[PDB]
């Protein structure tokens, strides 16, 4: 086994060893909740009577949306964060990148905080798209707009239309009925041949095909979950394909740290000697954002 012990100390030791060079992060909603961004897959929200929808989940379906986009953008206004301040967990991944350890971050989130925290396009697989860019729905024009531009149109309740061709401009998220990004399957084929460590943060691993990513790790590859709850285990209510095994007598590589993601990454950082660097990074980045509204 590559972990000397199935603890955070054990993972930290392995990370500082020569054996650990290429880290994949798998992240979800629980890495952005402390930034005041809710889980759009949990019981947030329900009262969409307003929008006269054929069925509830038509608000996030692509055919509906291209026909009647006003509902989605009005809800976008209600849900739009007052500020985009990435968390300790996002800045932790920036530390990984700075230290040469980050192979890739696969994210379920659309809130752009990974990019704001300084992960680049190349470092990221936005499994469900992002608000960071938007494009004109016309394939011939496909004009790109930044989030600031999308923000304004949303917060001014004026539908986003292309300046060049007056088409609708859709945020680059994956609505229901859209194809999952081809980059997801491309990168998965290539990345999991190189991975030395899977950091899994802020996801209960319920949405497919993202959940299946943990089965793509080599058998030897250590896997750490930072989360408010254990997750990723085999589910007998489905079949009975290599789920997380933390607590059995056959456990050899999987570790669960339970709590706020923020507190988990701080603890991992403290063990690695990075807590000061991480603190200094968050504070100057936060101040910088606070200063820019």
């Amino acid at each position: 086994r590559l972990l000397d012990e199935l603890t955070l100390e054990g993972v930290a030791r392995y990370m500082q060893s020569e054996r650990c060079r290429r880290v994949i992060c798998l992240v979800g909603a629980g890495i952005s909740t402390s930034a005041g961004i809710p889980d759009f897959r949990s019981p947030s929200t329900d009262n969409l009577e307003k929008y006269h929808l054929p069925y509830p989940e038509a608000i996030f379906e692509i055919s509906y949306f291209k026909k009647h986009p006003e509902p989605f953008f009005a809800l976008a206004k209600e849900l739009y964060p007052g500020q985009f301040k990435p968390t300790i967990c996002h800045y932790f991944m920036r530390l990984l990148k700075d230290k040469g350890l980050l192979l890739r971050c696969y994210t379920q989130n659309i809130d752009t905080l990974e990019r704001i925290a300084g992960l680049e396009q190349e470092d990221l697989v936005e499994a469900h798209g992002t608000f960071y860019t938007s494009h004109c729905v016309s394939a011939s024009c496909r004009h790109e707009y930044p989030l600031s531009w999308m923000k304004e149109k949303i917060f001014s309740e004026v539908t986003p239309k292309c300046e060049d061709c007056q088409s609708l401009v859709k945020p680059d998220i994956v609505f229901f009925g859209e194809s999952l990004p081809a980059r997801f399957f491309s990168c998965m084929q290539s990345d999991f041949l190189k991975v030395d460590l899977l950091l899994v943060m802020g996801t209960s691993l319920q949405v497919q095909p993202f959940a299946s990513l943990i089965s793509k790790a080599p058998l030897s590859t250590p896997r750490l979950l930072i989360n408010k709850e254990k997750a990723g285990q085999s589910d007998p209510f489905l079949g009975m394909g290599g789920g997380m095994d933390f607590d059995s007598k056959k456990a050899y590589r999987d570790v669960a740290w339970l709590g706020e993601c923020d507190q988990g990454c701080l603890a991992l950082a403290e063990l690695l000697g990075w807590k000061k660097e991480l603190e200094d990074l968050v504070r100057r980045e936060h101040a910088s954002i606070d200063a820019q509204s």
Binding site: E57, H128, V174, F175, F176, G177, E178, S179, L180, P209
Partner: peptide, 6 residues
């Protein structure tokens, strides 16, 4: 593949 809820 396509993004489905159900």
């Amino acid at each position: 593949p396509r993004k489905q809820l159900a």
